[PDB]
Amino acid sequence: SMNPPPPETSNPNKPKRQTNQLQYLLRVVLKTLWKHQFAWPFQQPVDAVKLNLPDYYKIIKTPMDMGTIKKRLENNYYWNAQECIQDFNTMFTNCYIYNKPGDDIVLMAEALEKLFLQKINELPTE
Numbered sequence: 586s587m588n589p590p591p592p593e594t595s596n597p598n599k600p601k602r603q604t605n606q607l608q609y610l611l612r613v614v615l616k617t618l619w620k621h622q623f624a625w626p627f628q629q630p631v632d633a634v635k636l637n638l639p640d641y642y643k644i645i646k647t648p649m650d651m652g653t654i655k656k657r658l659e660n661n662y663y664w665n666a667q668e669c670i671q672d673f674n675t676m677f678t679n680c681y682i683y684n685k686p687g688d689d690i691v692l693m694a695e696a697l698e699k700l701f702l703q704k705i706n707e708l709p710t711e
């Protein structure tokens with residue numbers, strides 16, 4: 586079995602910015618979600634080999650996780666907050682698509698998403 590390469594976290598041709606919203610996404614949103622009790626399954630790319638989920642990357646073609654998001658924020662990969670917010674939403678949606686409703690992992694993602702949305706409705710301006 587084989588995992589795909591992780592999503593891109595470095596690209597010298599991609600334009601970058603450090604905005605107040607992106608700083609907030611790292612300092613408040615990511616920081617808070619990362620230390621949540623249910624963060625651990627989302628702190629790295631889904632390891633389909635280790636978890637014995639050989640169909641995962643057949644079903645999920647746009648993988649995302651908070652480890653990748655953390656790298657993107659810390660290494661100034663983004664041009665804007667929308668890109669980052671989309672990464673969070675992709676992470677949640679992938680989880681809901683792949684896993685059965687009411688699976689533990691889904692309940693965990695839902696708890697993180699609830700927190701995420703509370704933090705996001707208080708972003709600074711752009």
Ligand SMILES: CN1Cc2cc(S(=O)(=O)N3CCOCC3)ccc2N(C)C1=O
Pocket residue numbers: 626627631636638641679680683684689690693
């Ligand atoms: C986000 N994850 C990570 C993951 C983790 C695991 S897990 O680590 O076995 N696990 C199951 C119970 O909930 C806690 C996490 C199983 C499947 C996945 N897949 C399919 C994902 O969607």
